[PDB]
Design a protein around this ligand. Structure first.
Ligand SMILES: Cc1cc2nc3c(=O)[nH]c(=O)nc-3n(C[C@H](O)[C@H](O)[C@H](O)COP(=O)(O)OP(=O)(O)OC[C@H]3O[C@@H](n4cnc5c(N)ncnc54)[C@H](O)[C@@H]3O)c2cc1C
Length: 272
Protein backbone atom coordinates (compact mmCIF):
# COMPACT_ATOMS: atom_id res chain seq x y z
CA UNK A 1 0.00 0.00 0.00
CA UNK A 2 0.99 3.65 -0.29
CA UNK A 3 0.67 6.45 2.25
CA UNK A 4 -2.17 8.93 2.05
CA UNK A 5 -1.18 12.07 0.16
CA UNK A 6 -1.80 15.59 1.41
CA UNK A 7 -1.91 17.48 -1.91
CA UNK A 8 -4.92 15.72 -3.44
CA UNK A 9 -6.09 18.57 -5.65
CA UNK A 10 -3.90 21.50 -6.91
CA UNK A 11 -6.70 24.06 -6.57
CA UNK A 12 -7.36 23.26 -2.94
CA UNK A 13 -5.51 25.08 -0.22
CA UNK A 14 -4.38 23.00 2.72
CA UNK A 15 -3.75 24.95 5.95
CA UNK A 16 -0.85 23.21 7.67
CA UNK A 17 0.11 23.69 11.30
CA UNK A 18 3.58 24.96 12.23
CA UNK A 19 5.16 22.56 14.73
CA UNK A 20 8.87 23.48 14.83
CA UNK A 21 11.06 26.41 13.86
CA UNK A 22 14.84 26.05 13.78
CA UNK A 23 17.10 29.09 13.78
CA UNK A 24 19.77 27.80 11.41
CA UNK A 25 21.66 31.12 11.46
CA UNK A 26 20.72 34.77 11.90
CA UNK A 27 18.56 34.94 8.77
CA UNK A 28 17.92 31.27 7.91
CA UNK A 29 15.11 29.13 9.28
CA UNK A 30 13.83 25.60 8.94
CA UNK A 31 10.06 25.44 9.40
CA UNK A 32 8.38 22.08 10.01
CA UNK A 33 4.65 21.79 9.40
CA UNK A 34 2.45 18.84 10.32
CA UNK A 35 0.65 16.98 7.55
CA UNK A 36 -2.97 15.91 8.21
CA UNK A 37 -1.77 12.82 10.08
CA UNK A 38 1.62 11.39 11.09
CA UNK A 39 1.24 8.73 8.40
CA UNK A 40 0.56 11.09 5.47
CA UNK A 41 3.10 12.15 2.87
CA UNK A 42 3.04 15.46 1.05
CA UNK A 43 2.55 14.13 -2.48
CA UNK A 44 5.04 16.31 -4.35
CA UNK A 45 6.63 14.81 -7.49
CA UNK A 46 10.33 15.42 -7.91
CA UNK A 47 10.72 18.52 -10.06
CA UNK A 48 7.63 20.26 -8.70
CA UNK A 49 7.03 22.78 -5.93
CA UNK A 50 4.29 24.06 -3.64
CA UNK A 51 2.92 27.55 -3.10
CA UNK A 52 2.35 29.28 0.21
CA UNK A 53 -0.38 31.89 0.35
CA UNK A 54 -1.42 34.29 3.08
CA UNK A 55 -2.96 37.67 3.78
CA UNK A 56 0.09 39.72 4.73
CA UNK A 57 -0.56 43.24 5.94
CA UNK A 58 -3.94 43.04 4.34
CA UNK A 59 -2.88 41.85 0.88
CA UNK A 60 -2.71 38.44 -0.75
CA UNK A 61 0.84 37.15 -1.18
CA UNK A 62 1.65 33.88 -2.98
CA UNK A 63 5.17 32.44 -3.33
CA UNK A 64 6.68 29.12 -4.50
CA UNK A 65 8.80 26.85 -2.30
CA UNK A 66 10.52 23.51 -2.77
CA UNK A 67 10.64 21.56 0.52
CA UNK A 68 13.84 20.01 1.80
CA UNK A 69 11.75 17.02 2.87
CA UNK A 70 10.56 14.46 0.33
CA UNK A 71 7.74 11.97 -0.07
CA UNK A 72 9.88 9.61 2.02
CA UNK A 73 9.07 11.73 5.08
CA UNK A 74 5.91 10.72 6.88
CA UNK A 75 3.86 13.23 8.80
CA UNK A 76 5.62 16.53 8.14
CA UNK A 77 6.99 18.92 5.53
CA UNK A 78 10.16 20.98 6.04
CA UNK A 79 10.88 24.33 4.38
CA UNK A 80 14.26 26.04 4.57
CA UNK A 81 13.71 29.78 4.28
CA UNK A 82 16.03 32.76 3.85
CA UNK A 83 14.44 35.60 5.81
CA UNK A 84 14.77 38.93 4.02
CA UNK A 85 14.60 41.43 6.85
CA UNK A 86 13.69 45.02 6.21
CA UNK A 87 16.39 47.68 6.44
CA UNK A 88 19.22 45.33 5.46
CA UNK A 89 19.77 45.56 1.72
CA UNK A 90 19.84 49.06 0.20
CA UNK A 91 17.84 48.04 -2.88
CA UNK A 92 15.12 46.28 -0.86
CA UNK A 93 14.39 48.44 2.20
CA UNK A 94 11.06 46.74 2.95
CA UNK A 95 12.63 43.29 2.95
CA UNK A 96 10.60 40.29 1.79
CA UNK A 97 6.87 39.87 2.35
CA UNK A 98 6.37 36.11 2.73
CA UNK A 99 9.71 35.40 4.37
CA UNK A 100 9.15 37.98 7.12
CA UNK A 101 5.58 36.71 7.56
CA UNK A 102 6.91 33.18 8.04
CA UNK A 103 9.42 34.50 10.59
CA UNK A 104 6.51 36.10 12.50
CA UNK A 105 4.47 32.88 12.78
CA UNK A 106 3.91 31.31 16.17
CA UNK A 107 4.03 27.59 16.79
CA UNK A 108 0.49 26.34 16.14
CA UNK A 109 -0.30 28.95 13.51
CA UNK A 110 -1.31 27.63 10.11
CA UNK A 111 -0.46 28.67 6.57
CA UNK A 112 -2.01 27.53 3.29
CA UNK A 113 -0.10 25.12 1.06
CA UNK A 114 -1.10 24.23 -2.49
CA UNK A 115 0.40 21.99 -5.13
CA UNK A 116 1.98 20.24 -6.81
CA UNK A 117 3.01 22.73 -9.47
CA UNK A 118 5.64 23.05 -12.15
CA UNK A 119 6.26 22.10 -15.77
CA UNK A 120 9.10 19.65 -15.03
CA UNK A 121 8.89 16.21 -13.41
CA UNK A 122 11.83 13.85 -12.94
CA UNK A 123 10.79 10.31 -13.87
CA UNK A 124 14.02 8.63 -12.79
CA UNK A 125 17.16 7.26 -14.42
CA UNK A 126 17.87 10.39 -16.43
CA UNK A 127 14.35 10.84 -17.76
CA UNK A 128 12.65 14.21 -17.46
CA UNK A 129 9.13 15.10 -18.53
CA UNK A 130 8.92 18.79 -19.40
CA UNK A 131 5.72 20.53 -20.51
CA UNK A 132 6.03 23.64 -22.67
CA UNK A 133 3.14 24.95 -20.56
CA UNK A 134 0.39 23.84 -18.17
CA UNK A 135 -1.97 22.60 -21.02
CA UNK A 136 0.22 21.28 -23.07
CA UNK A 137 1.46 17.75 -22.43
CA UNK A 138 5.67 17.12 -21.78
CA UNK A 139 8.88 16.31 -23.66
CA UNK A 140 10.41 13.03 -22.41
CA UNK A 141 13.77 14.20 -22.38
CA UNK A 142 16.38 11.58 -21.37
CA UNK A 143 19.95 12.70 -20.45
CA UNK A 144 23.24 11.42 -19.03
CA UNK A 145 24.00 14.62 -17.10
CA UNK A 146 22.26 17.66 -15.72
CA UNK A 147 23.80 21.11 -15.39
CA UNK A 148 22.25 23.14 -12.57
CA UNK A 149 22.66 26.85 -11.96
CA UNK A 150 21.15 28.15 -8.72
CA UNK A 151 21.26 31.61 -7.21
CA UNK A 152 20.25 32.32 -3.64
CA UNK A 153 16.92 30.73 -2.79
CA UNK A 154 16.97 28.84 -6.09
CA UNK A 155 18.98 26.04 -4.51
CA UNK A 156 16.04 24.01 -3.21
CA UNK A 157 14.67 22.88 -6.62
CA UNK A 158 18.18 21.67 -7.42
CA UNK A 159 18.69 19.93 -4.09
CA UNK A 160 15.40 18.05 -4.47
CA UNK A 161 16.49 16.61 -7.83
CA UNK A 162 20.06 15.90 -6.68
CA UNK A 163 18.80 13.94 -3.68
CA UNK A 164 16.29 11.95 -5.74
CA UNK A 165 19.07 10.90 -8.11
CA UNK A 166 21.63 10.08 -5.44
CA UNK A 167 19.28 7.90 -3.43
CA UNK A 168 18.73 5.61 -6.45
CA UNK A 169 22.01 3.64 -6.68
CA UNK A 170 21.04 2.53 -10.19
CA UNK A 171 20.56 6.10 -11.45
CA UNK A 172 23.78 6.97 -13.27
CA UNK A 173 22.83 10.60 -14.00
CA UNK A 174 25.62 13.05 -13.09
CA UNK A 175 24.58 16.41 -11.65
CA UNK A 176 26.85 19.46 -11.93
CA UNK A 177 25.83 22.36 -9.69
CA UNK A 178 27.07 25.94 -9.97
CA UNK A 179 25.64 27.83 -6.99
CA UNK A 180 25.85 31.63 -6.81
CA UNK A 181 25.29 33.80 -3.73
CA UNK A 182 25.86 37.35 -2.50
CA UNK A 183 28.50 36.34 0.02
CA UNK A 184 29.80 33.20 1.70
CA UNK A 185 27.67 33.93 4.77
CA UNK A 186 24.49 34.02 2.70
CA UNK A 187 24.85 30.50 1.23
CA UNK A 188 21.93 28.19 2.05
CA UNK A 189 22.26 24.48 2.70
CA UNK A 190 26.06 24.30 2.50
CA UNK A 191 26.48 21.39 4.95
CA UNK A 192 23.81 19.43 3.11
CA UNK A 193 25.42 20.00 -0.28
CA UNK A 194 28.87 19.12 1.02
CA UNK A 195 27.56 15.90 2.57
CA UNK A 196 26.23 14.92 -0.87
CA UNK A 197 29.62 15.71 -2.41
CA UNK A 198 31.34 13.64 0.27
CA UNK A 199 29.15 10.62 -0.37
CA UNK A 200 28.51 10.88 -4.14
CA UNK A 201 31.40 12.72 -5.77
CA UNK A 202 31.21 10.53 -8.90
CA UNK A 203 27.62 11.66 -9.55
CA UNK A 204 27.59 15.12 -7.96
CA UNK A 205 29.88 18.02 -8.87
CA UNK A 206 29.70 21.12 -6.68
CA UNK A 207 30.99 24.63 -7.27
CA UNK A 208 30.24 28.01 -5.71
CA UNK A 209 30.56 31.57 -6.84
CA UNK A 210 29.99 34.61 -4.64
CA UNK A 211 29.45 38.20 -5.74
CA UNK A 212 32.09 39.24 -3.21
CA UNK A 213 34.50 36.75 -1.70
CA UNK A 214 35.92 36.31 1.78
CA UNK A 215 39.62 36.53 2.45
CA UNK A 216 39.95 32.79 2.37
CA UNK A 217 38.06 31.46 -0.63
CA UNK A 218 38.60 28.30 -2.65
CA UNK A 219 35.94 28.84 -5.34
CA UNK A 220 34.87 31.56 -7.79
CA UNK A 221 34.07 35.23 -7.42
CA UNK A 222 31.69 37.25 -9.57
CA UNK A 223 28.46 36.56 -11.36
CA UNK A 224 28.00 33.36 -13.33
CA UNK A 225 29.92 33.75 -16.57
CA UNK A 226 31.06 31.84 -19.65
CA UNK A 227 34.21 30.43 -18.05
CA UNK A 228 32.29 29.12 -15.03
CA UNK A 229 29.80 27.38 -17.27
CA UNK A 230 32.61 25.79 -19.31
CA UNK A 231 34.42 24.68 -16.18
CA UNK A 232 31.51 23.62 -13.94
CA UNK A 233 28.69 22.34 -16.16
CA UNK A 234 28.79 19.42 -18.62
CA UNK A 235 29.90 20.44 -22.11
CA UNK A 236 27.18 20.99 -24.72
CA UNK A 237 28.63 18.14 -26.80
CA UNK A 238 27.17 15.77 -24.20
CA UNK A 239 23.65 17.29 -24.55
CA UNK A 240 23.01 17.80 -20.84
CA UNK A 241 19.74 19.14 -19.57
CA UNK A 242 20.36 22.60 -18.07
CA UNK A 243 18.22 23.66 -15.11
CA UNK A 244 18.24 27.14 -13.58
CA UNK A 245 16.64 28.89 -10.63
CA UNK A 246 17.64 32.34 -9.43
CA UNK A 247 16.67 36.01 -9.53
CA UNK A 248 15.17 36.83 -12.94
CA UNK A 249 18.79 39.62 -13.57
CA UNK A 250 20.70 36.49 -12.92
CA UNK A 251 18.89 34.30 -15.41
CA UNK A 252 18.61 37.03 -18.03
CA UNK A 253 22.13 38.50 -17.88
CA UNK A 254 24.41 35.89 -16.34
CA UNK A 255 22.91 32.52 -17.28
CA UNK A 256 21.20 32.49 -20.67
CA UNK A 257 23.73 34.60 -22.61
CA UNK A 258 26.62 32.54 -21.30
CA UNK A 259 24.93 29.18 -21.80
CA UNK A 260 24.47 30.26 -25.42
CA UNK A 261 28.07 31.43 -25.77
CA UNK A 262 29.22 27.95 -24.73
CA UNK A 263 26.81 26.44 -27.28
CA UNK A 264 23.95 25.06 -25.19
CA UNK A 265 20.58 25.50 -26.88
CA UNK A 266 19.08 28.50 -25.04
CA UNK A 267 15.48 27.70 -25.75
CA UNK A 268 16.32 24.03 -23.90
CA UNK A 269 17.53 25.71 -20.77
CA UNK A 270 14.73 25.23 -18.18
CA UNK A 271 14.01 27.80 -15.47
CA UNK A 272 12.08 26.64 -12.41
C1 LIG B 1 10.62 26.83 -7.54
C2 LIG B 1 11.03 27.79 -6.47
C3 LIG B 1 11.37 27.26 -5.23
C4 LIG B 1 11.75 28.13 -4.19
N1 LIG B 1 12.09 27.55 -2.97
C5 LIG B 1 12.46 28.37 -1.97
C6 LIG B 1 12.83 27.76 -0.71
O1 LIG B 1 12.81 26.57 -0.51
N2 LIG B 1 13.22 28.65 0.26
C7 LIG B 1 13.21 30.06 0.11
O2 LIG B 1 13.59 30.74 1.04
N3 LIG B 1 12.80 30.64 -1.08
C8 LIG B 1 12.45 29.78 -2.10
N4 LIG B 1 12.09 30.36 -3.28
C9 LIG B 1 12.00 31.81 -3.35
C10 LIG B 1 10.57 32.25 -2.85
O3 LIG B 1 9.58 31.97 -3.82
C11 LIG B 1 10.51 33.75 -2.56
O4 LIG B 1 11.03 34.43 -3.68
C12 LIG B 1 11.28 34.15 -1.30
O5 LIG B 1 10.71 33.49 -0.18
C13 LIG B 1 11.25 35.64 -1.06
O6 LIG B 1 9.89 36.06 -1.07
P1 LIG B 1 9.41 37.27 -0.16
O7 LIG B 1 7.94 37.39 -0.33
O8 LIG B 1 9.97 37.14 1.23
O9 LIG B 1 10.14 38.53 -0.84
P2 LIG B 1 9.51 39.60 -1.84
O10 LIG B 1 8.62 40.50 -1.07
O11 LIG B 1 8.89 38.91 -3.02
O12 LIG B 1 10.81 40.40 -2.26
C14 LIG B 1 11.29 40.44 -3.60
C15 LIG B 1 12.81 40.15 -3.69
O13 LIG B 1 13.47 41.14 -3.08
C16 LIG B 1 14.88 40.54 -2.68
N5 LIG B 1 15.10 41.01 -1.33
C17 LIG B 1 14.20 41.56 -0.47
N6 LIG B 1 14.82 41.85 0.69
C18 LIG B 1 16.13 41.48 0.51
C19 LIG B 1 17.19 41.53 1.37
N7 LIG B 1 17.32 41.99 2.70
N8 LIG B 1 18.40 41.07 0.97
C20 LIG B 1 18.56 40.57 -0.29
N9 LIG B 1 17.51 40.50 -1.15
C21 LIG B 1 16.31 40.97 -0.72
C22 LIG B 1 14.80 39.22 -2.79
O14 LIG B 1 15.59 38.76 -3.97
C23 LIG B 1 13.27 38.87 -2.99
O15 LIG B 1 13.06 37.73 -3.73
C24 LIG B 1 11.76 29.52 -4.37
C25 LIG B 1 11.42 30.03 -5.62
C26 LIG B 1 11.08 29.19 -6.65
C27 LIG B 1 10.71 29.73 -8.01
Amino acid sequence: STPAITLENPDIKYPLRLIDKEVVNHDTRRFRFALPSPQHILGLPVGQHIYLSARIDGNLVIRPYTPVSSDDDKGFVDLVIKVYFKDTHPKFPAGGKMSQYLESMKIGDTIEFRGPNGLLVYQGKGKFAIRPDKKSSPVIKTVKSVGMIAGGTGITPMLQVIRAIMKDPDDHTVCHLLFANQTEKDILLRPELEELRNEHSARFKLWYTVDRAPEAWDYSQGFVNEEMIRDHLPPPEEEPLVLMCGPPPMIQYACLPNLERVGHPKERCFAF
